[PDB]
Design a protein around this nucleic acid. Sequence first.
RNA 1: GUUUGACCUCAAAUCAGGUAGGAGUACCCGCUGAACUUAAGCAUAUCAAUAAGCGGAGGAAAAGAAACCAACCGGGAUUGCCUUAGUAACGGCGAGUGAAGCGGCAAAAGCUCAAAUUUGAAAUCUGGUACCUUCGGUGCCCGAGUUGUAAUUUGGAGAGGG
Lengths: 184, 94, 67, 129, 182, 198
Amino acid sequence: VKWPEYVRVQRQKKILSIRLKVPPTIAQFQYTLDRNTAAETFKLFNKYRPETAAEKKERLTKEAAAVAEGASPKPYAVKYGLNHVVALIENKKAKLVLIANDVDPIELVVFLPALCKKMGVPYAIVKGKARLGTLVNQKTSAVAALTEVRAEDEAALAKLVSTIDANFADKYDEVKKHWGGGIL
Amino acid sequence: SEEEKNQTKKEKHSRDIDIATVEAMTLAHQLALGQKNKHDLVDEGFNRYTFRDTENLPDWFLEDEKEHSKINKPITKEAAMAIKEKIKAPIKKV
Amino acid sequence: SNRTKFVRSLVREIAGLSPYERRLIDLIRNSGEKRARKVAKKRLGSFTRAKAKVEEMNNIIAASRRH
Amino acid sequence: YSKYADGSDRIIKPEINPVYDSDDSDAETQNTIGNIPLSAYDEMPHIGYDINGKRIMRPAKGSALDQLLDSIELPEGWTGLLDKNSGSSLNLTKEELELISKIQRNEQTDDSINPYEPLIDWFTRHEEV
Amino acid sequence: GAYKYLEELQRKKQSDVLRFLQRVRVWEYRQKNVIHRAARPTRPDKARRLGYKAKQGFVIYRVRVRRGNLKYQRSLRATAEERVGRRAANLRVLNSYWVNQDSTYKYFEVILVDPQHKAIRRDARYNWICDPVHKHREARGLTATGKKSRGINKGHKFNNTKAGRRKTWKRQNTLSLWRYRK
Amino acid sequence: MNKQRTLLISSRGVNYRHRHLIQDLSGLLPHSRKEPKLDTLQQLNEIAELYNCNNVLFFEARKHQDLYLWLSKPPNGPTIKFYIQNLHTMDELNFTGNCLKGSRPVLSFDQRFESSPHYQLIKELLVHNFGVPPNARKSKPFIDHVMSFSIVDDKIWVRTYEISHSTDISLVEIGPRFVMTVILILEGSFGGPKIYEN
RNA sequence: GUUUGACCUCAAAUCAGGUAGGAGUACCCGCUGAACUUAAGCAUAUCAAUAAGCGGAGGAAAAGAAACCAACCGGGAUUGCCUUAGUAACGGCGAGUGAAGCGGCAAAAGCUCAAAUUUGAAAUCUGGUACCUUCGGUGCCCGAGUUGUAAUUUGGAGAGGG
């Protein structure tokens, strides 16, 4: 019996990560926002999908056409860029931060939750970088953050932040102990 | 026969601790003479391979780690001589 | 720069302590600074580097159980 | 503390005793001989002179049967090289061999320390303003 | 940005997180071939500071080289660069960086730029590599590792190799004879 | 009773002759500790503390021609700088020496050492700094070599001789020989006011 | 949902568009690297950091804008020639080897990134298609990119504002 080499390699990697002891800085993920609150966050974030290329192009063409014949505030949108997210973090401008748990280079995201908690900025870990990508008109971003929001959604954002603090931040603060990967 | 079984326990432990490598022989030689006492070896016994769990990992992974987790350190001819004598086991052969 | 120091401290906390750093802090806790400095100046070559490492380990130990 | 000769205060640290620590690259010599070959003293019944200059009589007056037994079945502590304090082989204790084996296959050396200590986040305790 | 944090973290290679990452990646690469393409660089900060860009035309390759030497007089980094340039003949080698190492082998990541791609050609900041004079830079030791091995530097410490040992030896070991003898 | 230790430290630039001088000094003195290098000055006292050492010898050199030496008690003692000019290494074949490594030394001081308080201070410093303790870890019981010190023209001359017998004793010059001047004396170890200056 | 797709990794096309071998080789950049000969026969040594062999480029190549030289009233990229100098210095201090500062002159050009949020809008670009004032330009389309494509800037500092 034989299977493709890459399939065997990835299966071995999975069964090794399941069995290899990792420092608490690793395995800080795998304790993630529950399905309920994750769906609520997606619903809240689904209303602030960044304008896609087609939408921006059509809007600009329409504006130009009106101008050719001869005021609104900044459109609130989710911030996802890792460099931009880490810049909103450490500056206190960020209100809600989402972290993908399935980033290929783990080192790129290990320090993000620690920095977020050090700066006292709410943060949440959500399964699937694709899910963040699906709502940002990209394949994946590995991170998502929120900025100034419409007054209508301010109460929803505050409630979501409180729920996240009650569910994940406070409950899983013990994640520092219990070195992951100890399953027999 | 309780003592008989106990004797075999020490024999198994001794067989798993006897020096069998050139690096081990050099370490034993340095420990015997005053070059590196127990404290010096303990201080030197911390390197890249320390803090690595191996009881739970699969055998096919430990084997890969076994043959790729060694350090080549300066060996000594005097120590290398001792291991050769230890490995030593005739009229017909003569 | 305050930002650089903050980033370095965050990296040190998240990265942790290397096995030689672990032994250094263990000797500081269970022994005196003499053995720690002797080991630091035996792993590290330059004396000032060993002194800086010892000071960093002392600060880490002090901040571990405080605040 | 008292001051220097010219308006400079100086703390008089206690005089440091020139004692030797348990590990200071200096062992219990007890023989006064250096790294010289042990070929000498074979005919004499002593091995050098210890501190203060008195003869170190050779105690390794073993029997032929004992030597032969230790030759075929080498002692677990056998190390080949002889000891400076006597003609008997400087056999290592089982405890030393255990540490040597632990070092030689990437085992733990400084026991009693937990290899999986929780990450005590000292810096995260504070919050920036 | 996150680049500074990654750079700071990478310096602590002995750290537990990086320890586990290296212990996993050493087996992951050993299971793979000696030389294989990498989808993305494992050390984005190091590549970025080395001139690497995410635009089309840049390729990240992983290579394995044996360790040891009855002697050898070239760096394993230069050997890996040459062995990767001898396969991607249509790619120009710019630089490489260490990503991991093993007792028997060392692992290095090399960034490759294709001068044929129009994006590179149209880029004024990278079109300079399209000149044929830069062909097989690794084979001539013109890379960072090659220059370091060659000893090209300034000061008394590199007089014998300030402008190449062979060139200076040839220039100095010449009996100059002018028309009007001095 | 008497117990002492010495720390040997050499700055960058020590030529092979000076390196051999330091090496043979470390062999003549069994209570000596050697260190790799030093860069910059008060740090030297900490190094002695790390080894619980009661003395320190620093071989300064501004250029690689003129050797300099500092003798002091690291904790709080004074320091004296010597501008050594003449120097003969242990690797000279003109002197035949079978001296036992680290054996008890015998000092020889002339009357000039007692002619001034600072002369007495340097005499005592040499006595305890170069005088191996009777119960030193690496010392040897028998006496085979002696040390001779004579000061003339304001500078102290250092000589060493091995002893010999016959079948009522004779001695032959051995070891390094050099001349040391008195440049500067400090109240404290590598610090404090300058008490004496030539 | 005993389901569907997102992804991430890895394959295939005689797939669309491309590139690489090799030859030549006085000079250039590296790897590799001996011996004949010569000194107290030859142990260090000279021949030699050479020939042979191997890989990589052009009309020139390399290097080039200091982790440089100096210790002064400082010099101010690299390269080349004279001097420095057969000097400093090495040399079983025996044969021999042997620079570098500065000074005289041919020429001069300096620079570009990383690391700062565009965040009041990834503003970037590869490729296919229809046209044209076809070494390329415009509209449309697909895709790469947020694990970072646009703009400013980097020790001479620089950036947000009045």
